[PDB]
C-alpha cells in the first residue's frame, strides 16, 4: 500500500511491529548518511521534527519527515522490523537549507514545471560481486568468469544474486530486467520509469540494500567505476524523457526520425554543457580510469541513432517510450545533482533553441586526429583536475547548484586531487627502479 | 696521462694490457648504450670505423672513435683491464647523423662559439643507496637514517661509499665534495667546472660506474627522481658560466650586485623558455611526483640572490667563480639535450636583451594565489602530459633539437604517458573500495 | 553507570569489544561525553528569556561565567585518566581553549539554537572515563556559585581560536585547559572550592590515587622514544 498521511505510517508501524526508523539523506559528495530513531519517538518527530547536526551535509538544522517516502527494509531481524524514511532540511529560522542536494533537485523540478514539463528517468545500475577475505574485509577476488548476458554464476553466488533480486522486488522497486555484464562478476539491473525524485531515492536506497545483502550472504558488492584493469568499468546510464500534458514531448510521428524539435534542442543543450558538469557526473579519481578509449565508455562528445558507442544514444523505441540515454555517468555519482544538472541543461538548450548538429554514425575511435578536428569533435576531460578546472569557470553550474554547494564541492574535490597527485604508485617502482 | 692521438691509445693499451674496449653513447631518451670490441680490432676500428645499428638510437651507421675520450674503467678483472671510448656517428654517405644527442650538444657549442662564448658546467648529482633482496633484485630498504650532511653510514655501507669515491677519484673525475643528503640513504656528489661536453660524458660514465660498484659490493644505487613518498627527491642542479676571451662574462665588479647585464639577459631568456623544455629536463613521470610544493624542489619560475628556494639561484661567490644554478633538472634527464637547451635559451636571451624582471626575495610558497597572480609568478607543468603539450607547440625547441629528435622524443613520451594514464593503482583501491 | 556495563556485556556476548578510552587511536577523533544541562525553577526553564536579543536570561550568563571561572580546577575530575589528555590537543573536535559561543562549534561551552523549554548549555570537556556523579556535582556547584556571585561571562568568541596567534590570545586573555594530568592535579590541589564541594575525604583520596598513577606513568620508556632516538644517538 502507498502510505500518504502520517496516520497511515503510524498504523503500519503498529501493525507490522516496526521497532526502528532510519532517516535517510545524502551529503554533497554523494555519501549516504543516516541515524536511528526509536518507534515511540515517531509521533513527536512527525509533530515537531528532529534536530541534528548539519556538518554531516556541509550548524544545527531540523529535519521534517515526509510520510510519503516511508518504506520497510527487506530484512527481518528477530527483534522486529526495520523501516526507513526521508524528509526535508530546514534552518532554525524556518527557511529551507539550500545546501541539500534534494533541495537542488526540487528546485530543478520546479524550474521544469514553470514551463509545464515533467521528467522521467530510468537508470541502469552496474556493480561487481567480489569475495571476502578471512577477516571479512572487501577484496577483488572474482566469483565467475562469465561474459555478456551469460547464464552465470551457478554456485552459491547464483543464490546471492537471486536473493538480491527478490529483496529488491519485495520493496516495490519494479525491476525491468537483470543480467550479467561484459566483465567477469559484473551485473546490471534496470529500473522502471518514474518521477525523477522517486528514482533518485530508489537508487540511494538500492545501493546500501545491495551492499547489506552482499555482506550478510558472505560476499561484497562494489560500485567502483573501474575496480580492475583490462576489463569494462561500471556505468550508470540515464534514460530520460520529458512529458507535457501527459504526452511524450520527444515523440513526433511527422518527422523522418520520429523525434521532435524539442528533443533536438535538448540534445544540443546537453552536448553544449556536458563538459562543465562532467566532474559532477564522474566525481572520483577512479572514474577517469574508465573513460579511456577501447571500451564501452564514451570519451567523445557526439550523438547517434544507430551507433551505440556515442556519448548520447537514442534507442530505436518510439511512441510513449521515446527516450534519450546519456552514457557518461557512473554509480559513484550523486543522483540528485546529476539529474538536476541534466534537466537544467536540457531545459536551457530547449529555451535557446540550440542546434545539436549532425549525428556521428561512423566509429569515432577509428578516426584520425585531423579528421576529428575537421569534424569538431570535442573530448571529455582526461582527469579529475581538468574536470575541476572546467567546472570552476562555469557560471551555469554555479547558478544551477547554488554558491554553497558549488564552493564546498569544489573545495572537497580539489583537496582530494591534491592528496592523490603526490602519491608514488608501485607501477612507477616496477617500471623505473631497474631502468634508472 | 692525457691521451691525444690514436698511437698514444694503442701504446697505453699495450702497456697496461687492456683486453676489451667498450663504446659509449646514449639514445634520445637518455639510456646508456654500449657494445664490446676486442683489443686487436682497435687498430682497424681507428683506421676505418665500426658499423652498427642506428635503430638503437632512433639503419646502418658508422662510428668514428675519438682517441681523446679514452679512459680505463676503475675495476681490475683477473682477465685484464677494461676501457671505454666515445666517438661520432656518421651516415653511410659520410654526413654526420643529426639524431645523435652528442651532435645536438656540439651544434649548440658551435652556435655559442659563433659569438665567442664558452660554457663550463659543474653538476651536483644526488642518488639513493638501497639494499638488494635475497635474489639480487633492486629494492627500497634504507641503509641509514641520517640527515643533511650527517656522518653516516657507519656500517659496511660506509666502505661502499668510500669505494665509490675512490673509484671516481681514480678515473680522474676531480670531485669537489661528497656528502649525505636530506633524505635517508641519499647522497650527493659535486663535480668541478670543465667544458660542457666533457662534463656530460663524465656524468654518463659516472652513472653506470656507480651502479656497477653498487652491485659488486652487494647494494643498489638508484637515480629515480622520487623513490619514496614523504622525503626529498633526487635532483641534478646545473651551475653554469659563460667565458669570453678567457674571462668570466657574468662577473661585473662595477654593478652593485656584481653581475653583468649579460647575466641578466641570460637569466631572462632561461626564465622565458624554461617552460617549453621542462619536459626534456624532467623526462619521466616520477619527476613530476618529485616536483610538488613543500620540499627543496622548485615549482615556480623565479630568480633570487639570497632566497635559496627559487628556480634559479645566484651563489654568493664572485670573480671567476661567478655562476648561475638551475634547480629543475633531475638525474634521469639526458645531460646532452638538457645542456644544449640551456645554452640555446641563454644565448637567445642574450641576443634579444630579455629583461629577467625583479627578483623574488620572499617565500613564494607562503603567498596566496591572488598574490602570485598579481606578481605574475607562473608555474611549471604539473604532470608529464602538460609538459608534452607545452613542448609540442614550441618552435624554439623544435629548431634547436632538429625535426628527427623532436618527433621521436615526442612520440616516445606520448606513448609512455598513454600507457601510464590507464593503470589502476592500489591507492585507488584502498581509498575507494570500502567507501563506494 | 548502567549503560556502560550493559554495552560492554552485550559486546562480549556478541563477540566484539566496546571501549570507552578517551583516545584509543592516534590520528582520529577521541570519545567525549558532552553534557547538556538546564536549570528549572517553578516548573519552567530559568535560562529561556524571550525579551533578550539572544533569548538567554541573565542567570544563564552568570552560570556560564561561573563555569568558565572554575572549569580549570576540576578539569582533573572531568578528565581523570592520563589518556584523556591525548584527546585534548589542537586539531580535532576536542576543545582546548576556555571560551563560550552561540554559533562557533569548537568552543568549550556551546549554546544550541534551541529555545523555550529546550534551552540548554553544552559543556564539551568531559569524556566517558569520568565519574558522572562527581562531574555533575561539580558542574552544578560551579554554576550555582557563578549565579550567586553575579559572575560576568565576558564577550563570546565567534572566531576560530586555533587559527589565531599566541599574541592575539594573550591580548584577548583566552586561557587554556591543563596540558597534562600533572598540571591538572597541581591546579586542583590549590582549589579551595573543589575541596569544599567534594569534601576532605574524597578530595584527599582522589588526589593520592591520581598522584600515584601519574608517578607510575612518568617513569616509563615508550617505544616511540626507542624508534626516534636509538639510531640518532
Residue numbers in the entry:
A (entry chain O), B (entry chain D): 5 to 62, 70 to 447
C (entry chain L): 215 to 447
Copy text from the publication.
The enzyme, glutamine synthetase (GS; EC 6.3.1.2, L-glutamate: ammonia ligase) plays a central role in cellular nitrogen assimilation by incorporating ammonium into glutamine, which serves as a carbon and nitrogen donor for the biosynthesis of nucleotides, amino acids and lipids. Here we describe a structural dissection of the archaeal Methanosarcina mazei (Mm) GS and its regulation. Like the Gram-positive GS, the Mm GS active sites are formed at the interface between two subunits in the hexamer and are comprised of five regions; the E flap (Mm residues 303–310), the Y loop (residues 369–377), the N loop (residues 235–247), the Y179 loop (residues 152–161) and the D50 ´ loop (residues 56-71), which is the only active site region contributed from the adjacent subunit. Like other GS dodecamers, the Mm GS dodecamer is formed by two interfaces; hexamer and inter-hexamer interfaces.
